[PDB]
């Protein structure tokens, strides 16, 4: 245990934040994933870049009611992950509000990554594939990398690329 992080996962409900956190940390999956009643850890130990990394994954609610409580944790987050489901368009159009909360609460060393979940319905995807980086044409830290939890496609790519992008910068 050489370093501790605080990577948080934020996004409007129904997209699959808990499913991505589970696919990375413990690889389990049930189709009736009960919605997170608040915030919740899922601690992880990853060994990379010649260091042991104690990664803490704060899974958040997504409702409008808990939007205050989650606001307490945007400060310490070394890397923030924002998610939108490609089958519902309004689950992407929420993103101005999430970006407003990020720009209000986050820190200066907070890398902000966007992730599109549930890619196995790309043929039914009501949101396109080009729109991601087109929205990420804002502040240059905003990456974009679509993935899919239930089929385990580019899942750990998200977290591993994120922790590399984090610890390649700070001393």
């Amino acid at each position: 245990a050489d370093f501790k992080l605080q990577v948080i996962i934020i996004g409007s409900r129904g997209v699959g934040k808990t499913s991505l956190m589970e696919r990375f940390t413990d690889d389990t999956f049930c189709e009736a994933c009960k919605s997170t009643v608040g915030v919740d850890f899922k601690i992880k130990t990853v060994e990379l870049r010649g260091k042991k990394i104690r990664l803490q994954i704060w899974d958040t609610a997504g409702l409008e009611r808990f939007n205050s409580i989650t606001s307490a944790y945007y400060r310490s987050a070394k890397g923030i992950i924002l998610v939108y489901d490609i089958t519902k368009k309004e689950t992407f159009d929420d993103l101005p509000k999430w970006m407003k909360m990020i720009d209000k609460y986050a820190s200066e060393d907070a890398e902000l990554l966007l992730v599109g979940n549930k890619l196995d319905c790309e043929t039914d995807r009501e949101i396109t594939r080009q729109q991601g980086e087109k929205f990420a044409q804002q502040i240059t830290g905003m990456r974009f990398c679509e993935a899919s939890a239930k089929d385990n496609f580019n899942v750990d790519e998200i977290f591993l690329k994120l922790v590399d992008d984090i610890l390649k910068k700070m001393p």
Binding site: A1, T25, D26, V37, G38, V39, D40, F41, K42, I43, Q56, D59, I69, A72
Partner: protein, 479 residues
């Protein structure tokens, strides 16, 4: 009679045939449970003959080791002096006896039974721990290999409950390396309806939530310590042991992550029931009232008010001689009144209302010798005065100002008590008269408490607020 036992000792002392011996001591087992007398009072057996007969004559054997390690446990109960002679050996032997016989659900129950009857002494736990065996590996292997056996899971767990209390502060943090968590937690799942297994599992989880890199892993979402709630709700609604242990664990868990506990509503709705149902087990009070004094900002940021206050008054009244009960209870009363203004109207000297201000007054005046109780008591009499203009007329007449100034001057070498007592003296006087003897007695003491802590930002803020109340007759005021 005794000459039969002499023949038995003479037979067991000389090994000639490897199979006949297992009869003789077996008959002794009958005389072990034959309660006609304490004929095993000679102290020659069971400590100097039976241990060499038990380790040498059959180390690997289930021939003799089973009935031998059964005779030892049947002896330790009846003949008491063996408990003094087993150590001061039997501890290097039992680790090998568990190691070799790693594959018998009927020869490991007796080993763990001698362990759970043997570790109650002390000074043998230390000698077992300092060895090459690493007994935790043995008990955890015996628990791993044998699900569904009700006695390896218990007689284990009860042998960890007494072994985790004195291990380390780093081996404990190691056992959270994906070990303790699986064996201990799982037993909770298979035997969720048996009492003693659940009580000892709650104890063991309570005994490795001591570090700070461990409360994270326990409150996490991979081994979620909300098994405390299900244990306090189903397997023991009306038994004080599991309630007390569960609630002390829940007090230990409340580190800087409150909004997991209070949001999961069943972890602040159940602790209150544990307080109100059992007002006579002081450990339950010093756990639960402290836990709810911590969690009250979150439980009132999200009736529900009336929960604590009757229990806090009952805790103040009954456990008078204790200091921790009164500290935690007036802490919870203060932190309840400061975050719910309405029941300020429900705490008064009149009929129906609770006279808790007198109780906090007497609870400060008794326990003069402790800084923590005066700290929390001045914080609990501050809030009880700033929202009322009738409680600052009884205490002003009973003589609490001289008492609190003597208390401050006795604890002159601490800034906490000076700050809290000065806040009490500031809130107590506001909007009253000052008969010049009062000022001439007080103001030197506040100036003494003002030039002995000349760094703390609130001990001069409260002081240069409190002295503002006091600043023939002219031939006295000039003096």
């Amino acid at each position: 009679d005794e000459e039969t036992l002499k023949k038995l000792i003479v037979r067991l002392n000389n090994v000639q045939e490897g199979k006949q011996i297992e009869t003789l001591v077996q008959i002794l087992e009958d005389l072990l449970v034959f309660t006609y007398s304490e004929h095993a009072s000679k102290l020659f057996q069971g400590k100097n003959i039976h241990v060499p007969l038990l380790i040498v004559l059959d180390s690997y054997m289930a021939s003799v080791q089973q009935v031998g390690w059964s005779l030892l446990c049947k002896l330790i109960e009846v003949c008491p002096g063996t408990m003094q002679s087993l150590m001061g050996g039997v501890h290097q032997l039992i680790l090998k006896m568990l190691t070799v016989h790693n594959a018998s659900v009927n020869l490991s129950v007796i080993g763990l039974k001698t362990l759970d009857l043997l570790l109650t002494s002390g000074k043998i736990t230390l000698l077992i721990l300092d060895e090459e065996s690493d007994i935790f590996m043995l008990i955890f292997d015996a628990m791993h290999s044998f699900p569904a056996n009700d006695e390896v899971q218990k007689l284990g767990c009860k042998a960890l409950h007494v072994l985790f209390e004195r291990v380390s502060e780093e081996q404990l943090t190691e056992f959270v390396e994906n070990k303790d968590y699986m064996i201990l937690l799982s037993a909770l799942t298979n035997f969720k309806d048996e009492e003693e297994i659940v009580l000892h599992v709650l104890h063991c989880l309570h005994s490795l939530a001591i570090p700070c890199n461990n409360v994270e892993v326990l409150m996490s979402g991979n081994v979620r310590c909300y098994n405390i709630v299900v244990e306090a709700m189903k397997a023991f609604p009306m038994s004080e042991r599991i309630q007390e242990v569960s609630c002390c664990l829940l007090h230990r868990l409340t580190l800087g992550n409150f909004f997991n506990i209070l949001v999961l509503n069943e972890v602040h709705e159940f602790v209150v029931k544990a307080v109100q149902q059992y007002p006579e087990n002081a450990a339950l009070q010093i756990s639960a009232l402290s836990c709810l004094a911590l969690l009250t900002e979150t439980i009132f940021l999200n009736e529900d008010k009336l929960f604590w206050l009757e229990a806090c008054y009952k805790a103040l009244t009954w456990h008078r001689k204790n200091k921790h009960v009164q500290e935690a209870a007036c802490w919870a009363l203060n932190n309840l009144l400061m975050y719910q203004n309405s029941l300020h109207e429900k705490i008064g000297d009149e009929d129906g209302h609770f006279p808790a201000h007198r109780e906090v007054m007497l609870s400060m005046l008794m326990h003069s010798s402790s800084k923590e109780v005066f700290q929390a008591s001045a914080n609990a009499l501050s809030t009880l005065l700033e929202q009322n203009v009738n409680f600052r007329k009884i205490l002003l007449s009973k003589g609490i100002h001289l008492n609190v100034l003597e208390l401050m001057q006795k604890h002159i070498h601490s800034p906490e008590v000076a700050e809290s007592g000065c806040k009490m003296l500031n809130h107590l006087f506001e909007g009253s008269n000052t008969s010049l003897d009062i000022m001439a007695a007080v103001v030197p003491k506040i100036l003494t408490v003002m030039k002995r802590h000349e760094t703390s930002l609130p001990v001069q803020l409260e002081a240069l607020r409190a002295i503002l109340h006091f600043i023939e007759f002219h031939h006295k005021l000039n003096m």
